[PDB]
Amino acid sequence: NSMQRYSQFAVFRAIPGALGSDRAEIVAQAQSFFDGLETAGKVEVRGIYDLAGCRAEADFMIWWIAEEFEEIQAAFARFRRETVLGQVSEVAWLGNSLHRPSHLPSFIMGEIPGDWITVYPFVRSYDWYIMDPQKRRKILAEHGQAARDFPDVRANTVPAFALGDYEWMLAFEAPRLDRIVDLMHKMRYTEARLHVREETPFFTGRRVSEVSELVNVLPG
Amino acid sequence: NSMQRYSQFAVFRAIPGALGSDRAEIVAQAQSFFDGLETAGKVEVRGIYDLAGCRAEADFMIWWIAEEFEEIQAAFARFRRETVLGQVSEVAWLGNSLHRPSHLPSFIMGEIPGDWITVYPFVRSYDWYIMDPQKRRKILAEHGQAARDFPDVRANTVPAFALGDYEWMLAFEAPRLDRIVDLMHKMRYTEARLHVREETPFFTGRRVSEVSELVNVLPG
Amino acid sequence: NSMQRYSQFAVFRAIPGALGSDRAEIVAQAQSFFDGLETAGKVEVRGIYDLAGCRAEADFMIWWIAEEFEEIQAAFARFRRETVLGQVSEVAWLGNSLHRPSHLPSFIMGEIPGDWITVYPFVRSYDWYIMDPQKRRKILAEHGQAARDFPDVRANTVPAFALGDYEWMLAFEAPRLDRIVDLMHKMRYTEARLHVREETPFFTGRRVSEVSELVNVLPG
Amino acid sequence: NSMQRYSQFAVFRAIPGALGSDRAEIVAQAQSFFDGLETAGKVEVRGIYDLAGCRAEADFMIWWIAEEFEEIQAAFARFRRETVLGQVSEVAWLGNSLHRPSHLPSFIMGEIPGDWITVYPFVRSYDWYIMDPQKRRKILAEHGQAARDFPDVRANTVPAFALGDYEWMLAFEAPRLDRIVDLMHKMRYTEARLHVREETPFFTGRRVSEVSELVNVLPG
Amino acid sequence: NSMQRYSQFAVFRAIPGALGSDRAEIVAQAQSFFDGLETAGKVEVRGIYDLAGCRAEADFMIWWIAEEFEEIQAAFARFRRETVLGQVSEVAWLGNSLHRPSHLPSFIMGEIPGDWITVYPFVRSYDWYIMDPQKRRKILAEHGQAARDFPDVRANTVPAFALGDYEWMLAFEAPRLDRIVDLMHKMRYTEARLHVREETPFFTGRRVSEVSELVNVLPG
């Protein structure tokens, strides 16, 4: 541990009729942008995800992590400004979180990202934090134990206070989507469900190897 | 059973002034797209439904089922990309569910789809799943018995965790719409109503024989 | 009784700058459409109401009743498709209900529609239907007694399950609007108010004699 | 008082880029419209209020009162139809109320309107009206007594049942805005706060002497 | 102190495709506008903040304070009217507050603004103000003690009654964003959390030295 890492799930919705039918130059420009980000060494793009078919207001997602938040701001603004892909898309939702130095987030461990991801914000009940620490730790122990049968699903739980309307950001990565569905269904059977205020919206996506795969399927 | 099937209710809203008045080529292209989907053998389009007059933000719906979710993603993106019908429509709502290996969904049995359908998402109360299994099973038995007076209405209840903001997807198919209305009204008289958080939005539609019947009624 | 009738309150909002200033041909076309509906004998247009000044997102309303819901769907689609008035308007809200075979809705009796109408959907509490039938009957008797001092206000309470997000559709018709306001205010003084979940949005309008009166006041 | 008066707070939001930079003719036309309203003698425009800086979706407000509601409808439609100012604005919110024949609204007395106004709708709790009349009258007496230290703030509480989604319309007029802020803060210290369901949105504005002052500040 | 100061957090969202690529003249015009505001001596612009990456519907924010609210209205309208930057932006959210003459807001003391800010509205529970003053003051003392471990984060709590939909405006200024995140997380561990109704939306931003730095990063 002992590392500071802001994380961002930037969710974009494609504007129909704006991308056009000739997309080779757009693909090349977006790929050059991401290669420049990678060679700069400040912002690490953990993944690019196709959100088609998940919900009506989202089309794709970029999950990237940087040591400072201003670097994420610069990368996000540059993506929206200097690339055609960012110019023909609307920002639908932004999930920001900060990891500060037991169990650590999967992206902190450096694990290989899974094929499928689900991402959602999380807000606990008002009395959750002032609850007796004995009871809170027991509830959290049961909640964690409920995920013992899913070693293939990696979980990221990162604090998100003051970086949005939420308190935590949760991200599940799995080779198969049905494993994520089963994990959520089984986690419904826990006492921690009694201390939940907000858990929406959900964003479920498939990791693409390169930006060309994403661009070639966007509408318009 | 012993087969995995993802299901999707893709709801689209027609943009006024975009379809135009000459629709023969649009009809032919949409029919060719659906015939190609059928001949590919991966995605099975269970139905196409006209949602006109049900609610303000919906115009039609496609109910299709595939073994893998990426196939549904590909079909959905292709519909929005390579057909004029998908290019002049906005995605209003997406209801995703996964059926995994009692009483099984109607589309799992392969029953003939009914003339009328009603589709809605469903979210249970926070304490529903950690409730005493005896009490939950008794409540579910009463809820099921309340629907034994409507043998002509087929019910699909499919888990929807992590595939959206919801927990279950419910679909009722009947030859007559008044049967669905009566079933919902009678199902209001059950104890399970005490454990409901979200059940909206509703989408009520009539099954069309072919895409031409749907296209010829959409607003110009 | 012994008659099945679906009812629809189709609420439309006028798009500014689309109707124009020359409206004689639009008036003639809309009148021809409504005369064709009347002469077809399937859909009965009970009223056309001007909603200007009631709320921000509504401009007028068509209240029509038909034996089958397919006929209402067809008439609604035809209005939105083959008339300039329907082409330059957006659907803001749709209230659907079904009357099936005590006290009957005013439109079932065939009473002359009042000059002023108010319309809203209604959703009861979760425990309303499983409440002890004696207590529910007493509450409903008190609620009905509260409306005995307003014989000039006719009330239509029609089930709306599965035809939208609601449970009941309520419509009050009166020669004067202050009578409706007083009736609602006095009905606030009832125990049934303890079993209400949703009762919005409201749509208050004045019945117009012919579509020309409505068209000549819509924003250009 | 033996007078019937409907009151309306019509809130409009200016469309950027539609008003233009040359506004003398627009000012003259709007002033002519309001002079015609005053001459006709049916609708009394109590005030015109600049709402800039109060909230994102509002730009100005017209507060007008008429004996019949159809007169208000005609004036509102005419403003949106036959004036450039009404043609380049969107209706953001409409607050309607009816005053029917103790303490009466300020506009019934005909008091000089204050420089600053705040306006909001109000919805009481479900059990407020069936509460024991002694307890309700005691609560209302305390609530009224809490406003003894603000004689310079005039309050208008008018029933709003069936004329929208609300129950009451509340308007506070003061020479200074800080007096309104202090009054609201002091009214927070009352038992009536335990019986409140809805009190938003708020509209705070400054009374303008003539429509030219309002038009000259709207965004181009 | 005896200083009466209205404060405003004007949040703007940039319209894509409206700013263009040549921004030198826009920068010069905006800088001239802000220099004129500073010279006039009525409205003091406390800060300009880049909000990119915080949320989907916000792009930047202006925090300015003036003795009278009409001066803030004039400055806001003038910014939206006479500058290209204000003409190519939409108002997303407005947070207004009034400070009337223990512990004072940071902007009242004149402290140097921090590099990072987090701004949100706040609404207490209905029974918060009529709670026993002993208990309320004890809860507030504990809440204040919870923030004594963060001397580097300056807090501004200003009443916001009748100037919007909220009750208080809260702003946290820090040299580092992680300090704000930690302060919010630690403040979750207080009894005052039991008396919260609304605390969203949040606006987290980085203070820019000049308007050129802000304009050069906005999407084209």
Author numbering:
A (entry chain A), B (entry chain C), C (entry chain D), D (entry chain E), E (entry chain B): 11 to 111, 117 to 235
From the manuscript:
Coproheme decarboxylases (ChdCs) are enzymes produced by Gram‐positive bacteria that are involved in the coproporphyrin‐dependent pathway (CPD) of heme biosynthesis (Dailey et al. 2010; Dailey et al. 2017; Layer 2021; Pfanzagl et al. 2018; Zamarreño Beas et al. 2022). All ChdCs are homopentameric proteins consisting of protomers of 250–300 amino acid residues, each with two ferredoxin‐like domains, with only the C‐terminal domain having a functional coproheme/heme b binding site (Falb et al. 2023). The enzyme catalyzes the final two‐step decarboxylation of two propionate groups in the substrate iron coproporphyrin III (coproheme) to convert it into the final product heme b (Celis et al. 2017; Dailey et al. 2015; Lobo et al. 2015). In this study, we used cryogenic electron microscopy single‐particle reconstruction (cryo‐EM SPR) to characterize structurally the apo and heme b‐bound forms of actinobacterial coproheme decarboxylase from Corynebacterium diphtheriae.
The apo‐CdChdC cryo‐EM structure adds significantly to the structural knowledge on coproheme decarboxylases, it is also the first reported actinobacterial apo‐ChdC structure. It shows a complete absence of loop (108–127) densities for all five subunits. Missing densities can also be observed for the N‐terminal regions. In the cryo‐EM structure of heme b‐CdChdC, amino acid residues N6‐G235 were observed, while in apo‐CdChdC N11–P111 and S117–G235 residues were observed but there was no density for the N‐terminal residues as well as A112–R116 due to disorder. In principle, multiple distinct conformers of the loop can be resolved in cryo‐EM structures but dynamic disorder that we expect here averages out molecular density. As a result, in the 3D reconstructed map of the apo structure the loop density is only partially visible (Wu and Lander, 2020). The conformational change of the loop (L108–I127) in the apo structure seems to be accompanied by some additional conformational disorder of the N‐terminal residues (M1–L10) as they are located close to each other. The apo form of the protein exhibits greater conformational variability, as indicated by the lower accumulated populations of the first five clusters (78.5% for apo vs. 92.7% of the heme b complex). The apo form shows increased RMSF of loops 108–127 in both clusters 0 and 1 compared to the heme b complex; however, the effect is more significant for cluster 1 (open loop). This implies that the loop has increased flexibility in the absence of heme b, which is consistent with our cryo‐EM data indicating a lack of loop density in the apo structure.
